Design a protein around this ligand. Structure first.
Ligand code: MG
Ligand code: MG
Lengths: 335, 335, 330, 330
């Protein structure tokens, strides 16, 4: 009855998931798998530009890390079918490389002396349930092999959109995310894999429009909103920290006080509520998947018709990470 | 038949207006008035962080500047009633200090051996017509004393909103501007005049929500949209360059091609049209008041109802400056 | 040790934060002219130093911080604050009253010691904790905790002098931008043509004083050091380079070993190849970086380069608190 | 002078731009493996260097630039490009083939001279225009235009040597971040632990080579200079500080006057207190800043600090074009 976790892909998400797990009661990481030099991985675990110094000590040892006194095995196997997760008692694997984001690619972690459950850090395609914790994790019964923890933006959008739907009914809506730059943008103008003419531009020196998927795909999490939402992003020069705006039409007339009260009533460990006039640096490292900001709510009535704007913050890094760890722990406990 | 211009307030807007005027055929600045040390003003005219080096040479002389060989008188009088604009043949004054943004304060430039017309770089209050050039400058007949060149955001919003209105009819709409930080924000966290808890934060290190006025005040420029638009801003870490999004409902059903075609048909020297996937640095220093970006248009149809998103870029500095100079030249020529 | 803070700016607020985690020290009174609601918001939320560790509420006459009440007043003259009503022994003068005129805090029901957060002038001792705090005997009224740059430079320069003897040296600080720079190009009080420029969009040369004033802290180095700064677009976090000539021939290994031997709570030592974000919020006044040492030997002559990191905010703040606590106890 | 560009990266694109404004020079062929539509977009729109001055259209087999056709190919081996079909005399090799193996461009219907945009190795002369371009006689096949940092350092270091004699010196470049740094923390090819860090959110120490390699351009300074860099968050624009000892006693005024006397099209002189954004797009290879000079005299010994700005992009590009034109004419 301790959740032993394996991480495949020790990038930003995998490293932050490891950090977050150190502060969660019933979870621990007993194996890391990644092709990168362990000295590079240990250094990036110790020092994070936006998320601060590691809370403790990390040493490179033969075959892995010593982290806060405890040994963690680190391997460098290319294929999930060759990873002996069971040797370290791993029950559930966080698949966060980005290369196995499907059910038939990610299920390879489950084999003889492998793992028993898999959570992918991506939408994941067909036959893979998409879980935003505390919004729709009740769709898990335990029989699943591979599930998805959705995207970082989905984990921000979903509880806000669900509260609008549950209380007032959504007709349609357009999302605008004002988003930190990410690793798929160039640091200086140049060709990038995929050939997107905007991600080719210096991400820390520009406002960069970019496409999104969370709004169009919201139906995977909230079925009654399937096809009702669309959106786009503006990437801007902060290294993490983002904000999701939704402009929508509803089935009921509302006021600002009732919209804000509905969000406060929906608050929990995943969906926070604030009336403080915060800015993006204030949500770096938070453990909410989504933090509704009541100061930004607009209910615009013009000749009897209403447009409603609701806004939620998220650390696109740690907010998503905290939600992944909740889903990892819950999925592992329901077997 | 040369427009002799006086500038009161040699801040960013006044300096850029001077720069822009050097490249406009029938206009010239013969007097500058500002309380700042002329050596500071000359240095800031020569070197601009976002708008580049001055196109030519500037020298501090006794009583003013020598700019590209020609002498420009620079004085330091506190009150408009004490400025002898007529001594330098000044017909029209750009009032850009921010302290005389009303008709009874700005009309003091008009006195014996003063100026004859005034353009304020601000909304300006009652009894002051608000002019966005090439959107509503036909409301000027010549009898006016003091007029307003509107705000920088109004000059971006107005032609886009007018084209939606003229072609399709607007029911209502919500504006989001993703905006460069400005001089009313702190460089590092601290108390600021006015006590706004968000402008108190480090403007180049945060996404900062902020209130706007352009959408609510659009009726001063487009009367048939009075009260139909509202909005807000997200200030982000670029030093200039901004983008205005409008999400609206219309009186007619539309498609993306028809919205984009309507914008292209409305293009002129003030309102540009582009289908290139540009980013914010690409519009630094442009002379359009507004540059519609067809790549960002969304027409979302859900169960017969449409939400329409249209997006226009603007250099909140030089875009606004170029519009001010157009209005200055036109106002002066119609006497 | 009950502390009073005059001037709840960045330094004052961070000193309040740092004191919450140091035993035997607490702040019982804050004096500042700003609206307490603005002061409370900025204490709760800090762009570079993170959210406040705990709760802050505005109450009548002050704040409730983590359950404890803190008095907040807006008296404009130090002679008017009754520091003793709240048991305040020592005042952190951080408004920016840097004369021995900081002694107005010290009167009947006022404080009994004062620490200025700046160079303090002629008859004010300048203390960099764990470098020269032995010059305090306890009889002083007003002392100075030096500048943030001095607290970084001093232990590094002292270790060079104690081990090898410094002939002369030039400092280059690659420094975060600060509140004396404009956010966008424009006139600024004082009229410096370079601080008038957008501080987060430029490399901005700026003058310094820490190297020229080092004699106040290390007498043997008086008039031996000079330097300047390059302000660059990070909101906090800085690094001090010193190129020096010495009286002995040295090697990189020997210099690095001397630095490691001098390490303590104020002067840290690292061999990790870190960057500026990694020192945000540290409690060292100075963190020597052995990876950047250069000992260049040409025709028997040597130029020696030593480099130390500091959070120009929290490194300096931690040093102030150390000096506050120590001064109050003697 | 008809120029061929192999490698249409930042340096290649800016060289194309700069050539549009220099008479007697034009680019008639570009070779690069990237999609021409991506290359055309990046030529049109540049984050730091502004919009392209004119029009660019993708046509079959190349671009139409300001009415003139420019051939664009994607041949992966220099031996395969028929440079002479487009009248190309000299090739700017900017892909990053830095051996005398750049001579594969030179064959029957290929080019007849090559300039590498990097240090070129053993048997390749290294030219900084207006510092040592007299070492070219015309018989060379493959030459090097040195590095961007070298083109800044060289005229400043040469003027010190010619006027006063340099004993030794240490360089500190406060440098814009570059494309070899990560935008966010992560593994990078090569495994440098510091270039793995977010380049626009950090002060990042990094190694240099220009000072150690200065002998290739100024023989008298071989083995006399060393240095390092601090990468900081501006997208372009850099500044080079040199702390040196000299063979003569000097003063600030004398040093500044020597720098002014050495000024030309490559090496500029200013007394204006500028900042980094003010040198974006300049055509000087190096802009000496007299406001930052220090001459520190202690017990008869002197440390001399001289500082020069450069746009690590356009300063270097302008120098390459000068060397391209001059090499082609002799
Ligand atoms: Mg932090
Ligand atoms: Mg420019």
């Amino acid at each position: 009855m301790v959740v032993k976790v394996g991480i495949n892909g020790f990038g930003r998400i995998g490293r932050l998931a490891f950090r977050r797990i150190q502060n969660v009661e019933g979870v621990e990481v007993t194996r890391i798998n990644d092709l990168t030099d362990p000295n590079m991985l240990a250094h990036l675990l110790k020092y994070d530009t936006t998320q601060g110094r590691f809370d403790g000590t990390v040493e490179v040892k033969e075959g892995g890390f010593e982290v806060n006194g405890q040994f963690v095995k680190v391997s460098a196997e290319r294929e999930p079918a060759n990873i002996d997760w069971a040797t370290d008692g791993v029950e559930i694997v966080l698949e966060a490389t980005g290369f196995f984001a499907s059910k038939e690619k990610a299920e390879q972690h489950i084999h003889e002396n492998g793992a028993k459950k898999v959570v992918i850090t991506a939408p994941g395609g067909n036959d893979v349930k998409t879980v935003v914790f505390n919004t729709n994790h009740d769709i898990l019964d335990g029989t699943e092999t591979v599930i998805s923890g959705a995207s970082c933006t989905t984990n921000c959008l979903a509880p806000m959109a669900k509260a609008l739907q549950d209380n007032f009914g959504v007709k349609q809506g357009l999302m605008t995310t004002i988003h930190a730059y990410t690793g798929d943008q160039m640091i200086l103008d140049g060709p990038h894999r995929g050939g997107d003419l905007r991600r080719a531009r210096a991400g820390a020196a520009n406002i960069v429009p970019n496409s999104t998927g969370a709004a169009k795909a919201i139906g995977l999490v909230i079925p009654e909103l399937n096809g009702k939402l669309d959106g786009a992003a503006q990437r801007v020069p902060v290294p993490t920290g983002s904000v999701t705006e939704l402009v929508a039409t509803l089935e009921k007339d509302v006021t600002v006080e009732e919209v804000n009260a509905a969000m406060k009533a929906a608050a929990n460990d995943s969906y926070g509520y604030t009336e403080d006039p915060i800015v993006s640096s204030d949500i770096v490292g938070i453990s909410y998947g989504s933090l509704f900001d009541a100061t930004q709510t607009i209910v615009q009535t013009v000749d009897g018709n209403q447009l409603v704007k609701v806004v939620s913050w998220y650390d696109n890094e740690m907010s998503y990470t905290s939600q992944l760890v909740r889903t990892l722990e819950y999925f592992a406990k329901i077997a």
